[PDB]
Design a protein around this ligand. Structure first.
Ligand SMILES: OC[C@H]1O[C@@H](O)[C@H](O)[C@@H](O)[C@H]1O
Ligand SMILES: [Ca+2]
Ligand SMILES: [Ca+2]
Length: 857
């Protein structure tokens, strides 16, 4: 039901029909879809299919296939004479779009946004059917991609004379020197005349705080009359003098709305808004990164797009929760490995104050890892002349279209600081690489012309291998205001890059790739396939090309010229289950094989691994950290020489005293005391390393503290002390400041992260359930199967435990805990009410939580 009550751009997610089938031909309006599934977008049709060992480990053993989406809807007669378009933020992949039986075009890339005009084929005042065919033919990805319309879809309805799609670009070239006073904004606006008569228009533009009223504007302008021929467009340039704009920053992410009205006479024809923030950056070859004139270390993570048990679905609350968990770790930046983010993530980062390195491509013109259906099939092909897809430039290759489409979408987003043009473009491919520098220069030229305001970059793993191609490409980046990302350099190679390429501004575009499970303590070693399909939680386990967390951070924190780090990864993701990876078919190890990653600091369910608190101790200057591993039950610890257990403390404290309290005692005994040394770089960054007589001989391991404690039932506890040898007040210190021997599992403890959510059929409530003993201590290895009974105005949409080899259905109402924890994800309906969730487990006390849902005004 499409009419004039809708906003100019309106949500089009509701009430689609879906069918998985590679034989059906369902483009015609009269096709009978009465037996098809009924779904709301966003939607992922891989995540509900069964695991199969004849699929590929790298994409989580889940199939893709051909999916059809249909939606029949009325276009009211009050929209006659208006322009109508449908906008896709992402469809994975190989979309074909028909409207009322007429093929509109196609779009290969699964991660870039695109649109189609519907006006030409619309039945105004009648029934209409839009149809999307999706062909995710495997193999197409080095990770789990998902399949389908996994991001939001909207409708755009405008007057015949209107601002174009993504039609306003904003530059503040003098912001760094004008800051504090009047700031010049240079705007360019595309105005299209899609009528059959000449138009003469003016623009009224207004900049006012986001969510505020226009009378709080900090600047306005009205332009002179502009003539636009019928069926043509014009670019209208204008200048706004913004009166003392608030800067956008990590701490204070102030946002503005920039509103453009197209006027004919005194009547508004079209109103187009774009979100904006005032900020400037710099990358210096010697001193690194700065935001708004102040030095900032990029403390970043790489993040794949999926949302755990939800699959690829770009649910806004799921994405927001990820960012919130990362911020709590001290993360201030995200690299969207290796593809454009959902706009929802860009929205969140604009609002939260998180810097985004938005990467556009993984491979370029050569497919990777035998994935013959990946984007390397399409990167260099032309766009057919009858393909009416819209979003970016269509005059060269798909790569240019997809790159400019992404830049057009996000060019005004203050959170985005760099455009990353590729990742390890020469890794895992066949043929010569001699043409790759020329491809790189072409991408750099396109980017610089599409957006002069931000550096372009890439993530190159051949700089450490001294490939001449990397020298050429890095110089070409540098010659165009770009910044060079090196993948998996160590301290010595950072120094070699600085010596060999003194003109480059560099950063660690991908680092670490430590591999750990959550809650595994009976060995401190890893880096390879184990006997239990899990990996140690100690930070001693990494892939051969990577480095443990303390090593990759130690090498970055010391060097002001390494602007920052993008740790692989912030969250575990589906697929790439290294060291159980497989780029071909077949189970890796005994089935069920590990099907999600072990790289994440946080698991797929949002539950942090122990190294989360090492990073928090290093990165979060707004909280204190005091965290002990391992959990202190005899059957989970590792007994080495002398039956001693290695005890690790992550903390930002200056000094720690370790204690032991035997079970049944209330009196603790001092067992150790260690003090950090404070280091300061030339730029003023600080960090702590242990330099005591029993320090580790491997320097980077001294960014934390280790004791060897004999096993005995009781409690290990730690006290934090500051530089003055005074006790640190409890406050809001995070982590396990003590570990203690538990009893047997007795009860469940369920808690919803948000007790009230929006009744829009989108918002989510995340319910963590712990298996604990009778005194509330989590049983560290508990794997009890927990069943969720969801009643009321909501639906269970996912269950998760983060365990890589668990093939139980994400859509079941039950799942085993892993390392004491399990997750349920409930979604609201479109009616306000109450959701009651009861978590049950055999032999244990149940736990019930209640969640209110609130109607949309
Ligand atoms: O360690 C695994 C990672 O290795 C990197 O070299 C690659 O860019 C990532 O996408 C991921 O595969
Ligand atoms: Ca493959
Ligand atoms: Ca801190």
């Amino acid at each position: 039901a499409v009419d004039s009550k809708q906003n100019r751009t309106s949500d089009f997610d509701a009430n689609w029909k879906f069918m998985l089938s590679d034989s059906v031909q369902a483009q015609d309006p009269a096709f009978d879809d009465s037996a098809w599934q009924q779904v709301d977008l966003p939607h992922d049709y891989s995540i509900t299919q069964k695991y199969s060992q004849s699929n590929e480990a790298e994409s989580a053993y889940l199939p893709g296939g051909t999916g059809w989406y249909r939606k029949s809807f009325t276009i009211d007669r009050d929209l006659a004479g208006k322009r109508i378009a449908i906008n896709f933020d992402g469809v994975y992949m190989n979309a074909t779009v028909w409207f009322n039986g007429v093929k509109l075009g196609t779009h290969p890339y699964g991660y870039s946004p695109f649109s189609f005009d519907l006006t030409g084929n619309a039945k105004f005042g009648g029934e209409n059917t839009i149809v999307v065919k999706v062909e995710n033919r495997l193999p197409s990805s080095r990770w789990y991609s998902g399949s389908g319309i996994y991001r939001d879809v909207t409708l755009t309805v405008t007057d015949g004379v209107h601002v174009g799609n993504n039609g306003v670009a904003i530059k503040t070239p003098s912001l760094a020197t004008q800051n504090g006073g009047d700031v010049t904004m240079n705007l360019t606006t595309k105005v299209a005349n899609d009528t059959e008569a000449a138009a003469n228009i003016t623009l009224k533009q207004t900049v006012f705080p986001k969510g505020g009223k226009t009378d709080a504007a900090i600047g306005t302008v009205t332009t002179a009359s502009k003539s636009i021929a019928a069926g043509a467009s014009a670019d209208v340039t204008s200048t706004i003098t913004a009166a003392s704009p608030k800067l956008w920053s990590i701490k204070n992410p102030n946002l503005y709305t920039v509103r453009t009205e197209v006027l004919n006479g005194g009547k508004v024809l079209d109103t187009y808004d774009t979100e904006y923030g005032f900020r400037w950056t710099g990358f210096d070859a010697t001193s690194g990164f700065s935001l708004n004139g102040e030095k900032v270390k990029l403390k970043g993570v790489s993040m794949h797009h999926d949302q755990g048990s939800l699959g690829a679905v770009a649910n806004r609350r799921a994405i927001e929760r990820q960012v919130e968990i990362l911020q709590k770790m001290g993360v201030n930046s995200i690299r969207t490995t290796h593809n454009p983010a959902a706009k929802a993530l860009i929205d969140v980062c604009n609002e939260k104050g998180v810097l985004v390195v938005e990467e556009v491509f993984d491979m370029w013109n050569r497919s990777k890892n035998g994935n013959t259906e990946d984007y390397g099939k399409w990167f260099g092909q032309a766009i057919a002349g009858d393909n009416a897809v819209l979003g970016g430039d269509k005059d060269e290759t798909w790569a240019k279209f997809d790159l400019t489409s992404t830049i057009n979408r996000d060019r005004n987003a203050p959170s985005v600081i760099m455009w990353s043009l590729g990742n390890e473009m020469m890794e895992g491919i066949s043929g010569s690489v001699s043409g790759f520098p020329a491809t790189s220069a072409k991408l750099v030229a396109w980017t610089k012309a599409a957006d002069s305001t931000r550096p372009m970059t890439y993530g190159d793993n051949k700089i450490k291998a001294n490939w001449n191609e990397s020298n050429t490409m890095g110089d070409n980046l540098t010659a165009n205001g770009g910044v060079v990302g090196t993948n998996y350099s160590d301290g010595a190679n950072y120094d070699k890059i600085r010596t060999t390429h003194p003109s480059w501004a560099i950063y660690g575009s991908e680092t670490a790739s430590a591999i750990n499970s959550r809650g595994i303590y009976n060995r401190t070693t890893g880096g390879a396939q184990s006997s239990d399909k899990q990996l140690t939680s100690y930070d001693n386990s990494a892939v051969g090309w990577g480095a443990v967390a303390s090593s990759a951070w130690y090498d970055v924190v010391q060097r002001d010229f390494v602007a920052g780090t993008y740790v692989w990864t912030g969250f575990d993701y589906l697929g790439e289950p290294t060291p159980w990876n497989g780029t071909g078919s077949g189970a890796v190890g005994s089935w069920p094989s590990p099907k999600n990653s072990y790289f994440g600091i946080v698991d797929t369910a949002g539950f942090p691994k122990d190294t989360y608190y090492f990073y928090q101790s290093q990165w979060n200057d707004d909280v204190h950290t005091l965290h002990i591993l391992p959990a202190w039950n005899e059957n989970v610890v590792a007994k080495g020489s002398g039956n001693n257990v290695p005890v690790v403390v992550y903390t930002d404290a200056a000094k720690v005293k370790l204690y032991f309290t035997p079970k049944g005692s209330t009196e603790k005994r001092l067992i150790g005391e260690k003090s950090f040394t404070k280091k300061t770089t030339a730029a003023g960054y600080t960090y702590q390393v242990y330099e005591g007589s029993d320090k580790d001989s491997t320097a980077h391991k001294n960014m934390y503290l280790t004791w060897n404690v004999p096993w005995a039932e009781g409690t290990i506890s730690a006290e934090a002390y500051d530089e003055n040898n005074r006790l640190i007040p409890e406050g809001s210190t995070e982590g396990n400041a003590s570990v203690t021997t538990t009893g047997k599992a007795a009860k469940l403890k369920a808690d919803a992260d948000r007790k009230t959510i929006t009744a829009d059929g989108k918002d989510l409530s995340y319910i963590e359930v712990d298996v604990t003993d009778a005194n509330g201590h989590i049983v560290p290895d508990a794997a009890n199967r927990v069943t969720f009974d969801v009643k009321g105005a909501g639906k269970l949409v996912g269950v998760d435990n983060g365990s890589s080899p668990d093939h139980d259905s994400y859509q079941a109402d039950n799942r085993k805990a892993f390392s004491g924890k399990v997750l349920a994800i409930v979604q609201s309906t479109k009616e306000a009410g109450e959701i009651t969730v009861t978590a049950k487990a055999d032999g244990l006390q149940s736990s019930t939580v209640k969640i209110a849902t609130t109607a949309v005004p």
